[PDB]
């Protein structure tokens, strides 16, 4: 078939762009070639079948609240992203992102995507959050949230370590095919 349209949303500064550009270019974060252009196409094989993903990168800021949904029609799957070391970004999944995409596309599948998981188990990061009266988001709570908000599932990845990165896009395709 044709391009699978995957719209990627979530708070600014959760690493959305970094993971899209890294995966689609086969580059680690420090080596990706910068571009003045938006979004990303990638062809991926699953079970010996090629599939093409159009990845629509979006601006999470309120300035784009009116413009952003203009991209929503015909979306095949959404990625709703938060950083596992940013409780605010996680809370915004609940109060902003899920309501927004489900208001526009009530029947369209979406995944919850946790990012920056490489920082989650770092003791110094945990401790820095602890001093700020925060804790990181565990897979258990995000999985529970995914089930509670009726996401197709929860996936997580590190743009840096590459851990779970292939899997995020595979599950996006699998969610779009049904």
């Amino acid at each position: 078939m044709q391009t699978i349209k995957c719209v990627v949303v979530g708070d600014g500064a959760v690493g959305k762009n970094c993971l899209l550009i890294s995966y689609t270019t086969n580059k680690f974060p420090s080596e990706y070639v910068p571009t003045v252009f938006d979004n990303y196409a990638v062809t991926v094989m699953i079970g010996g079948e090629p599939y093409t993903l159009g990845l629509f990168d979006t601006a999470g800021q309120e300035d784009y609240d009116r413009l952003r949904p203009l991209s929503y029609p015909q979306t095949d799957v959404f990625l709703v992203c938060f950083s596992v070391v940013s409780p605010s970004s996680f809370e915004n999944v609940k109060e902003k992102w899920v309501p927004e995409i489900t208001h526009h596309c009530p029947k369209t599948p979406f995944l919850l995507v946790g990012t920056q998981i490489d920082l989650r188990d770092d003791p110094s990061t945990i401790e820095k959050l602890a001093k700020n009266k925060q804790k990181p988001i565990t897979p258990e709570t995000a999985e529970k949230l995914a089930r509670d908000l009726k996401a197709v599932k929860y996936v997580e990845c590190s743009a840096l370590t590459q851990k779970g990165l292939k899997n995020v896009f595979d599950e996006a395709i699998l969610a779009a095919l049904e």
């Binding site: 270019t25 080596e31 070639v33 991926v44 784009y64 015909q74």
Partner: protein, 264 residues
């Protein structure tokens, strides 16, 4: 076909392989995370995981910055390499690029941004009896900031042109390239490129060639945007009317802004 990767090993734990580099041929479409997990996992089984690290960058390795006790693997996507003149089976040469600035960081402002093209020559040619081949030579070439911008433009222009004129039509792919071309909301958009590189007509004649080349890439680029816009008008759903209006508005504004710069 296959997907190629530069692979190099660092630390005395690797014995004979220490400091050796290869080009690996992976099947079909293999992505960085997959070969990376394979290699890190394999060496984790040999050495124990605590001793194994993947180098997360393509820059030449400085052993003094490494924990001597560990086994480091540098893994870099490469494509089969042809000199520009060649551009217009047997593969001995492969290239990876890495962004850098003269101020010592990988990424910077448009006017700072260089790119290094590292060209690897293998000891033998693919196709080959084994699945990886030793690297026998490494050369480095550099693109200056305007040259980096020229490539960014040409490559986007081609992507957009294909998205626009492919049959059968794929409206999703067209909209994705096009919105990202005239409608960028995350990255800064191509206007900035023209303002930086084309706004002043350089005194230096060597620089005039690149200036003129970039100017011509902008002609081609904005032309293909217009074709993209008119084409999409025909592909959209009624729901997407306001979406299209915006894309058209974005195109017009960019077109009018570039105009003075494309004539010069």
């Amino acid at each position: 076909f296959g997907t190629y990767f530069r692979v190099g090993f660092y630390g005395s734990r690797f014995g004979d392989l220490d400091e050796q580099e290869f080009v690996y041929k992976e099947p079909a479409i293999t992505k960085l995370p997959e070969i990376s997990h394979r290699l890190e996992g394999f060496y984790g089984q040999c050495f124990g995981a605590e001793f194994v690290e993947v180098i997360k960058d393509s820059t030449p390795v400085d052993k003094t910055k490494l924990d001597p006790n560990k086994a480091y693997i540098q893994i870099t996507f490469v494509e089969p390499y042809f000199d520009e003149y060649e551009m217009k089976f047997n593969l001995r040469r492969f290239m990876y690029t890495t962004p850098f600035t003269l101020e010592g960081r990988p990424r910077g402002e448009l006017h700072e941004q260089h790119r290094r093209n590292t060209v690897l020559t293998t000891m033998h040619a693919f196709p080959y009896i084994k699945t990886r081949i030793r690297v026998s030579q490494k050369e480095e070439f550099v693109l200056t900031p305007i040259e980096v911008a020229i490539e960014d433009m040409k490559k986007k222009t081609l992507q957009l042109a294909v998205a626009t004129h492919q049959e059968p039509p794929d409206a999703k792919m067209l909209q994705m390239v096009l919105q990202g071309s005239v409608g960028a909301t995350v990255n800064q958009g191509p206007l900035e490129v023209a303002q930086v590189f084309l706004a002043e007509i350089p005194a230096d004649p060597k620089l005039y060639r690149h200036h003129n080349k970039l100017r011509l890439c902008f002609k081609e680029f904005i032309m293909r945007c217009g074709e993209a816009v008119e084409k999409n008008r025909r592909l959209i759903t009624a729901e997407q009317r306001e979406y299209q209006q915006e894309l058209k508005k974005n195109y017009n504004k960019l077109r009018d802004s570039l105009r003075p710069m494309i004539e010069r």
